[model samples]
Structure formats: C-alpha cells, structure tokens
Target chain A: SDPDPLQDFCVADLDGKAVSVNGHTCKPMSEAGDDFLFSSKLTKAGNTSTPNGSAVTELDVAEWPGTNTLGVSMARVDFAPGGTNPPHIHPRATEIGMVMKGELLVGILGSLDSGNKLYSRVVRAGETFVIPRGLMHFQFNVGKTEAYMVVSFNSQNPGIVFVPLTLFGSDPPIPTPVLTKALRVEAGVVELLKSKFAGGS
Target chain B: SDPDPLQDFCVADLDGKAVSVNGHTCKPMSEAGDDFLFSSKLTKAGNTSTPNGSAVTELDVAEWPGTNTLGVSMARVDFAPGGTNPPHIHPRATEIGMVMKGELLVGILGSLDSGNKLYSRVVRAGETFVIPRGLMHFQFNVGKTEAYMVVSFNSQNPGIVFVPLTLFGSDPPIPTPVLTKALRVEAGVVELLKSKFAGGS
Candidate 1:
C-alpha cells in the first residue's frame, strides 16, 4: 500500500516544488522539532451540517505533513442522527476504525471478483471494523443520537471516491444518456439526480 | 508495508493451515458475519507491572482475525508513572498514536543515513505523534500519574524488536565479543545486562 521508508523519518517539506518519488521530500532534520507531534485536532467534534449530515476531519499527509512517508493517517468522522457517510472507496489503502460514540450501520460491498456480496453489521461504541482497500464501504448513523468514529488507514493519503459524486456529480457531468442506459433509468430520473448533484464534484 | 488485498476482504481463517500468499486465505463469506467487527479489546487498560512498567494490549491480526488482509491494526499501551516503553522498532509498519492520559517524553532516533540525530518531545494528553517504520523509538512517562496511548499501525502484524532484549536476552545469547565491540562495553556490563534481561527473548 505504501513504499517502505528509506530513512528514519521524512517530515515533509510540503512547500517544495521539487517532485519526489511516492511522497514528499523531507524537511531538514534541524527543523523537525514539532514535526512529530500534532495537537488536539481529533479531540473535538467535526461539523456535520452537509447534505449527508456527516463531516470528516482528516489527519492525512496533506493536512499533517509529519505523516508523509510514514504510510499512515487518521480521521475523526462525525455523523448527525440519520446521517450517512455515503458509499465510497479509498483507492489506495485499507481502513480500520473504532466507533467512539453511538451506533452505526457499517456496510461494505464485496469486489466484483467476490460476487459483490454485501457484508454489513450494526457496530456500536467500542466496536472495531475494517474496510478493505479499493472496496466500496460506508457508515450510517443508525441510532437516534449523534455518532462518531476514529478511523486509521494504511496510507498517508487514502484518496476517496464517492460513488454518487463520481458518477452523478462530475464537473462536466457524465453523459446523461450513458448514465440512463447504465443505470437502466429514465431520462427524467437522470435529470433529477444530476440537478441535485450539480456543482458538487 | 503490506501487500495490497486482491479481494474486498480476507478475514483470516486462522485454523486453516493451507498456505497463502502475503496473508491468510479468506474464510467463506457466509461465515464472515462477525469478521468485520471486534469488540472492546482496547477499551480497558493493560496491566503494567513488568520491569518496563508498561503493557501493550494489541489488536493485530493474531488477536483480531478480522484484520488479516486489511493491513491495519491497533493497540492500547498503558504505562505506570516514570515507566518506559523501551527503545524498540516495528520493522514492518509505521506507527501513529495519540496520548490518552498523562505526559510522555517521546524520542525517535534517526537512521545512520540521517546522522543518528534524535528527535524528541514531551507529548501530553490528546496530542498525536508519528514514528516512521523501522526506526528506534521510545516513550517514557514523564508525568506524576499513569499514562496510556492508543496507537495504530499500517500492518496487521507489525513485528517488534526490542533493542535490549535482542542484544542481551536472545535465547542462545549473542556472542560476548560481538556485544562488547558493538556496544563498546566491558564484559561485566554485558553480563549485568544479560542477567536483567535473562530468558526474555
């Protein structure tokens, strides 16, 4: 999932324009005083006022330069009641998480090679779960109260691809006729979904 | 750090002795009902009565079979006041952790290529830190109270190599000449260390 680090550590010199292999180039070790510590970013709840009623506070390499080349990162996901994080895939890394509050209906869709079986469960507080790399998975707040989880990944940057957004919310939009045919839906249905997902790539 | 999974999930069939590549072979998906969830193993404190005054309750693939091919795992480490999780290395994965209680003087030694510089800090509760894979790192409780941290790794089973135990407490014991020359220590010092670390390989 990630290249093995060649040095003891490589706190990213993120602003450097020079392209490096795999991850960013290391900042000078002399300036690495605070590079190993990140304070309190996951200690608070994240805003969950979006249409999905979920928010993700990520500590990936882009957000925490110290994580670059370390091949690991984390996020605090907050969900309002009835919220859904939506079906998505992390193209580059596996994910493991623990529910810190309330309950969630965790679902993972098997790969096409595995016959697309749906594996799901009601994960409560203190429960841990895993989502395979490049597979579609999601978490929905199934409880009446707010829910949150702390999730870790096997990559410094686990890039996400939301199914609905990638398909129905692309900037130039997927061709409506193609989507209609692929989804076996009517033109009107495609238009309706396109309208809701407009400008949301 | 770990091979990418070819399937959506491969919950380890620990009882199955069949050989598999990278990780274990997957059990039948129908039998994977509880394979994605692990309950409360990290919720409680670990016993810390050892010489190091620290204990690690791990949830790696061996402890939680659900983590087989997912390439991620976690642990809860508890430390008594003035305790030390002595210098050690995880040869297979990087580590990132958060201080849950008290304070710790965290230190990581650079690689020989990095001139063996030391990067260290006193991290407090709610703070996060990262250790690159294969580097020698340690955490010593600096606060007056007990401390604990939840740490995650990018590998399902990140192997550990304790500096002292490997050098002084191996089952057959390392050659004294090798130890003396490598450590620039007298035979008496090596013998004393060996006595303390006896039978601890």
Candidate 2:
C-alpha cells in the first residue's frame, strides 16, 4: 500500500500551523481537522467560453484547505475540440499538467508580443508536460476526442488570468500597441477580447 | 466517502496509440501504460547545521525525476539552538512556509541588508507567512525547542547552494567587509564552517 502520506498527524493541529519541509514533526491525528483533507469549494468554475475549449474548476480557499500544509493548490480543466486554453503563463507556479481524460494537443506560445512564437506538441492521458514558470504557453483539444487535465500548483495562492483581461483592464489599458502586436489578434480583436473579458477598453 | 479522484476513465486504447491529457477518448483499462504518477525523489541529507541554527534540503534532481510533470518540490530543515536558515532569495516561485511542529521563532530577512528590514514576531505552530515572489529572505529556529519547516517551491527544480556553500565555508569566506556582518562567532570559527562545508582554505 502507498505509505500513509500522513500517518503521524491530525488534520486540525496541522490546520493553521507551521510544518517544516520534512512535514511538521509528528502530531496526534486528533489535532488535524478532518475537513482539511477534502474541499467544499469546488463548485466554482473558470469563465465558460469555447474560445479556449477549456473548462477549469478552482480548488483552494474553497474546497481544499489541506493545500495549506503543502503550499500548493489544484484546478481541473476539460478541453473540447480545437478548444485551446489560450496562450498564457502562471507567473508563479510551474504547472505540472496531468491528463485525466480525453486527448490533448499542448503547445507553448513564447509571449504575447514581439518574437513570441508557438512551440507546440501533444500530451496524452496519463502523461504530463512541464510548463516552466512564466513562459507563455497553450493547450489544445486536438484529438478526435476530448481532453481533460488537472493542474496543480506549489503555491497556496495560485493566480490565473484571462490574459486579454490583464492587458486591457490595466491602469490605462496597457497601451493598445502592446496588445495588438503581441497576441497577433489585430487591434480590433484586442478590443473585442478586452470588452469580452470586461476589460477597460 | 471521498470521491475516487481517479473514477472517470480507462487508461488507453487497443490501438496502442498514446492518449492525450483528456485521457482516453474512450479505452479499456487493460490497455493503460506505465504512465501513472510516481514518487518524488529525496536523496542525501545536506548539512543541516548552518550558523545561526539553519540549513536547507535540496530537492531538484537530487530528489525528483526529470520526467516528472509536477514542477513543485519540498525540503525539510530542523534547526538547533540559535540556528538560522540564512537570508537569501528565490528569483522565481512564491514560497509558502509552514511550521509543522513546535513553537518556532520565525522572521524574514526581507530587505534587511538594504534597510527595508521586516523581522517577524515569533511564528508559532500552525501559522504561516507568505513571501511574495522575488523577496530576499531567511528563517531562524531561535528558541530552545527544536524547530522544523516545510518550504514549497512552484518549480519542479528548487535550486540550492552547492555554489553558495563555498562562499559560506571560506576562510574569511565572503569577507565580512562585503558580506553581512557576523551574526555571532568566536575567533576563527567562521574559518571552520568555511573549511568543513566549502573546502575553504
């Protein structure tokens, strides 16, 4: 049997406590809050849009408080045909994508602008790909079938963005020239995405 | 009852073609390959005795497989009297530290050298502090009680100090004139640490 990942500690005691890298010194299991192991906050979902063929469900600060001990969190994503998760990056966590369902075509987009190129490939179920932190990237449901994945992070608070939203919603909408040239989605398209995500046009 | 985290899909198809992240578009479990998750690697224990009661565990290639998809890794350090996990920095990834057991004194050396000092009041058990990305930092286990912590990195590879080892273990290593002033050391003791850990003259 898999060694009990947690044999020495309680959930509540572990809750709201400090755990060294080796795991908090053994604590009585009673101290650990049983609820800490599961989350009640998964009902939330990422923006529903076929534009990316990706459906994401968030976990931390909601259903998964156990993530607190590990400094990590997770999200579930399902991809549809030609559904691309769009080119984006996790400024913080290095994404370790796990294929839980369907087939997926995965790729990397260098950046939103200037020499930003698409580095592409396919990652199948049960397999994974490492998207180094901060590099622009994307994933597509290229299979004749569907693609499903779970994204895990090493941070308690992992950040996500509808990239176009970050650009246009900025202080002064982050200069149109920058957005237009980067995504290669024409200025009109940038404006459209900005409005679509409710960004400051 | 806990939902089977792996309840939904079969592993692979009879065709033997690799599956995508969406899992098998539809397949028989017997066909699944050796693509399930694997254990993390934890290797040789590094010297845990740093001056000021601190030392860290390295977990990149030393403890993980290059083929692993997850970019996150962990390390544990147990500090002795006056032990301190020196002030340093991570150019990438947000660091979330958890105290696993014992009431340990914790502090951040954030911008201390440059005058933006932020020393923490003792961080007791079950508490945490987040270091926004790219902050210079350190932690010390100052009390008589033993202290331990689990540090989480968003990257698959967490960099450690094989190189920094030399600097610390140097005879007059990292000259005190340029390095931060000594925390506390008897005459020539710095030379001992430098020589023992850094191969210093």
Point to the candidate with the largest DockQ: 1
Against the reference, the lDDT scores of all candidates come to 0.83, 0.50
* Residue A156 error, candidate 2, Å: 1.4
Task: Give the Cα-based TM-score of candidate 1 against the true structure.
Answer: 0.90
> Model 2, B1-201: lDDT tens per residue?
001113212222324464544222334533433332222222223455544455566543234332233445455566775677665665544455555445555544333332564546566553454443445556666567677654555644445433345457644468753434453665466556555665442
The numbered model that scores best in TM-score is 1
Worst 10 residues of 1 chain B by lDDT: B31-40
Locate the minimum summed-lDDT window of 10 residues in model 1 chain A. A31-40
So what's the TM-score on candidate 2? 0.41
Model 1: DockQ vs. true structure: 0.58
* TM-scores of all candidate predictions against the true structure: 0.90, 0.41
Q: Estimate, for each residue in A1-201, the C-alpha lDDT of model 2 and write its tens digit.
A: 001222211232234555644333434533443234333233233443655557777654334444444445656676666676776667655555445557676765443442454445566654455454466666778777666665556644456655655666665567668887887778887777666655342
